Design a binder for this molecule. Structure first.
Ligand SMILES: FC(F)(F)c1ccc(CNc2ccc(Cc3c[nH]c4ncc(Cl)cc34)cn2)cn1
Length: 308
């Protein structure tokens, strides 16, 4: 019922309490120096809105940002989740292949979290509209196999960075990958700003809405989340990419049988656009034994090599 932050930092499994993380007032930014535009994504209690920031950063830039905020329908545990998210992003630091923190507004009003604007939006929709744009002439530059490999390595690169900081995403999916200028992939998370209550990709499992089709077995059955369980989810993401945005396990209802099959080593078939090389990587990510899955660094070095 109560919303909890998605990413987790391990210290020992012992997770650190994000509410205990410091908030540097250096990230502080005047809310008046923001001019909001259209909403980029909205959930039940939160949303992400595009905006122009004036004098943001060291070079006093005037650029377009994405700003995350809560609605009025938010309780004390959304308010805390947003603050924990902010503290986590600060702690992690910056990387080219994640959605970076640009600033925050914590004084004189609701908490606003300012992040990078990614002009092409989420990866899943990009791939879907892209496939449609290519089938068009039969019925923007088209995609090539190299683009898929680049997207994949870029996300794995961002996930490699997170793991190096002992950070666990817990919702790795194409819907949570953003595409910025030059079509560079960045791993983020809409979280509060996603309509999970009406998203068919999120299944009711007891008292939660979970992205079951992206989840490792140990997460589904034991509620265990590791870097390795993210790797499983990455394998599903890899399948999303090389199928140009198909739903995982197409047509299959999530039920007792589905959980049974997953547990018993059932794996999706090779996607239409995946080289044998890449399907093997998927299969490795779907090892039932977590410590037998590849590390994000192994995946990154392999995919970078594949992108030539
Ligand atoms: F703390 C945690 F909750 F775990 C956590 C840490 C980091 C993050 C990453 N933060 C964010 C924030 C907003 C977004 C959505 C978003 C951005 N830039 C965009 N540009 C365009 C569009 Cl169309 C959507 C976006 C994605 N990730 C999320 N949650």
């Amino acid at each position: 019922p109560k919303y909890q932050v998605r990413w987790k930092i391990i210290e020992s499994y012992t997770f650190i309490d994000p509410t205990q993380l410091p908030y540097n007032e250096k990230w502080e930014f005047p809310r008046n120096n923001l001019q909001f535009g259209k909403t980029l994504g909205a959930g039940a209690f939160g949303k992400v809105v595009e905006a122009t920031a004036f004098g943001l950063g060291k070079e006093d830039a005037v650029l377009k940002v994405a700003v995350k905020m809560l609605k009025s329908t938010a309780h004390a545990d959304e308010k805390e989740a947003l603050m924990s998210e902010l503290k986590i992003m600060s702690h992690l630091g910056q990387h080219e292949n994640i959605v970076n923190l640009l600033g925050a507004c914590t004084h004189g009003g609701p908490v606003l979290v300012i992040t990078e604007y990614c002009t092409y939006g989420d990866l899943l929709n990009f791939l879907r509209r892209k496939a449609e744009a290519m089938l068009g002439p039969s019925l923007g530059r088209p995609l090539e196999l190299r683009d898929l490999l680049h997207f994949s390595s870029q996300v794995a690169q961002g996930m490699a960075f997170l793991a190096s900081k002992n950070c666990i995403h817990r919702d790795v999916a194409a819907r949570n990958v953003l595409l910025t200028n030059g079509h560079v992939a960045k791993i983020g998370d809409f979280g509060l700003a996603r309509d999970i209550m009406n998203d068919s990709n999120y299944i009711v499992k007891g008292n939660a809405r979970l992205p079951v089709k992206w989840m490792a077995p140990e997460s589904i059955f034991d509620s265990v989340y590791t870097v390795q369980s993210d790797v499983w989810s990455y394998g599903i993401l890899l399948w999303e990419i090389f199928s140009l945005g198909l739903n995982p396990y197409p047509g299959i209802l999530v039920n007792s049988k589905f959980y049974k099959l997953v547990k018993d080593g059932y794996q999706m078939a090779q996607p239409a656009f995946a080289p044998k090389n890449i399907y093997s990587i998927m299969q490795a990510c779907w090892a039932l034994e977590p410590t037998h899955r590849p590390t994000f660094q192994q995946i990154t070095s392999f995919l970078q090599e594949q992108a030539q």
